[PDB]
Amino acid sequence: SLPRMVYPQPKVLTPCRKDVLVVTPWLAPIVWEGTFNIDILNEQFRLQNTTIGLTVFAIKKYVAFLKLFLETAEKHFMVGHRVHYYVFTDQPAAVPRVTLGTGRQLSVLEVRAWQDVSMRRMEMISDFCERRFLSEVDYLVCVDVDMEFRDHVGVEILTPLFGTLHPGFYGSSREAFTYERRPQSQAYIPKDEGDFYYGGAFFGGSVQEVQRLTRACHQAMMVDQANGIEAVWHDESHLNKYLLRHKPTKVLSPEYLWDQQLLGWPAVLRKLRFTAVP
Amino acid sequence: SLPRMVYPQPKVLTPCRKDVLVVTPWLAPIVWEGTFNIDILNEQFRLQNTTIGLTVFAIKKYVAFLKLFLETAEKHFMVGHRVHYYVFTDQPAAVPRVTLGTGRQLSVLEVRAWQDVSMRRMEMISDFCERRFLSEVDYLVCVDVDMEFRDHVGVEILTPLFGTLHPGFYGSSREAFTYERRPQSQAYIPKDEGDFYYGGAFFGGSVQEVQRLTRACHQAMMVDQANGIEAVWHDESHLNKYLLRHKPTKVLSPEYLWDQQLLGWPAVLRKLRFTAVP
Ligand SMILES: O=c1[nH]c(=O)n([C@@H]2O[C@H](COP(=O)(O)OP(=O)(O)O[C@H]3O[C@H](CO)[C@H](O)[C@H](O)[C@H]3O)[C@@H](O)[C@H]2O)cc1-c1ccccc1
Ligand SMILES: O=c1[nH]c(=O)n([C@@H]2O[C@H](COP(=O)(O)OP(=O)(O)O[C@H]3O[C@H](CO)[C@H](O)[C@H](O)[C@H]3O)[C@@H](O)[C@H]2O)cc1-c1ccccc1
Ligand SMILES: [Mn+2]
Ligand SMILES: [Mn+2]
């Protein structure tokens, strides 16, 4: 039960956005700026005392990205909510000392030091950390570390399972998507199938759904490995196969996964929220 | 896990509908024709073996509406899915013998023979039938009987909690909504609050959410009764107060609750699905 709130009346006969698709054919929202009232969403999630886990791998030289990643997450990611960052690294002492807002904590998880890094992210999330995540957070968001937050990323993304439109392909036809196309791979998608091309750098959902997705991707990747085949874009190829067959309940627009150096700032993007570091 | 399916690729940069709002500010879809691919939704719900309960009251002279209500439900309501109709009447022998498709059954529940009819629908759904519904169906849809189905009403409506835009008010400002305006009533909504005006004739959701909603509306109605006040539109006024404070997870367009005699067939309605009997 939400408290009284005063905000602009939604207007049934006035679309919020007319330039973009805001709902998928299986009735999941596609989250763009203008489509949500964050005050309502914040109330709904706070009333449940929601905790959001953020997983990020920073192995070898990639530890250098953590300072900007974490400082910008503090400014823009789930502010006002409980957050638990899980940083997986082979160099725990290289993790920067970043000051965190109240209600936010960071755990460093030490791992060994691409195909094999790829398999290990799915393996780590689905197998090794399974019990810890179920006990500690409500939702999990799994992201690349070579990124920074430049604008709000909040509870508008939360749902049982979400994927994010890859910023290279949101305007493409399915035939141009770089899905795995060899039928010998568990990630195979035929040319006449496919809704969207989802980016491997930002996906998430409830803990139970994220564990299901990463367990499935890991099992598929191990089958391919035993069959001597490696999918074209590795874990991203398996993520796409999974989300084709298990539709996500929210799709995030490329506001949530962008690269301004390669793609600029198109009129359709009203906010660049989470962006590649050039 | 859905099977392979071949259907038109959704296009991110081509909205499905540009004339109407297709998502609420709390990211619930607003279900209009063109927004959903029923083949995908049918697959998702069948794979869960979904059972849909349909409740309808037909007391006194209103038993005369059951023949057309039920015959048209057989042609258009959840066809292909398991359905259990629950018909509440003071005249069980007046219930028409309507032939049902496979997987569909009808139970007649005998009750006693407006304020008090109104209270009794909420009471009946929340209290008397509580255990039976939890054991027998996954979702419950509660409708008026003076209605007929004229076109598809399917699993695109199913979600934890839905309400339907009342067809008289979908283009109105919140100040014109006929919410209960006296602060002495539990259904009171101030002039600056309100998202939509939902119709009392078609609402539903998972069994647990529908039981929560009808239990809350019944409790509120009893408080008003003890305080000597009756809300302006009875159970509909309390439904509106509930859905203002507990946002629905899907909103149905007025395609799902229409009256062609009073309102015609506007260009914005591509299908008239469930309609008043003139
Ligand atoms: O030494 C590493 N250390 C490390 O921590 N990583 C993590 O993996 C992420 C993905 O690598 P990245 O260099 O960012 O490649 P992208 O092209 O942006 O990755 C996309 O494609 C991948 C395909 O398998 C993934 O799906 C990834 O999620 C995508 O964004 C990084 O952000 C890090 O979090 C990756 C590497 C790495 C190891 C070998 C080759 C290239 C990178
Ligand atoms: O003798 C009845 N028998 C009966 O079964 N009903 C059921 O209540 C429903 C609502 O009554 P109805 O005559 O259809 O009124 P509407 O104006 O279309 O109702 C709307 O407003 C109501 C306000 O309390 C409800 O919210 C209703 O769901 C709305 O559609 C009917 O369709 C029947 O299912 C209603 C009556 C009735 C009893 C006294 C006065 C008017 C109607
Ligand atoms: Mn990256
Ligand atoms: Mn009626």
Author numbering:
A (entry chain A), B (entry chain A): 65 to 177, 181 to 345
Verbatim from the authors:
One important example is the biosynthesis of human ABO blood group antigens, which is the most important blood group system in transfusion and transplantation. GTA catalyzes the transfer of GalNAc from UDP-GalNAc to the H antigen acceptor (HAA) (α-l-Fuc-(1→2)-β-d-Gal-O-R, where R is glycolipid or glycoprotein) to form the A antigen, whereas GTB catalyzes the transfer of Gal from UDP-Gal to the HAA to form the B antigen. Among these is the enzyme AAGlyB, a dual-specificity GT, which can bind and utilize either UDP-Gal or UDP-GalNAc with equal efficiency.
Three of the structures belong to space group P21212 containing 2 molecules in the asymmetric unit whereas the fourth one, the AAGlyB-2 complex, belongs to space group C2221 with only one molecule in the asymmetric unit. The single chain in the AAGlyB-2 structure shares the least similarity to the other structures. Finally, as for the AAGlyB-1 structure, the AAGlyB-2 shows well defined density for the galactose in the tucked under conformation, whereas in the AAGlyB-2-HAA structure the galactose is not visible except for a few blobs extending out from the nucleotide β-phosphate. UDP-Gal derivative 2, which differs from 1 in the nature of the 5-substituent, has a Km value that is approximately 10-fold higher than that of both the parent UDP-Gal and UDP-Gal derivative 1. The kcat of 2 is 1–2% of UDP-Gal and lower than that of 1, by a factor of 4.
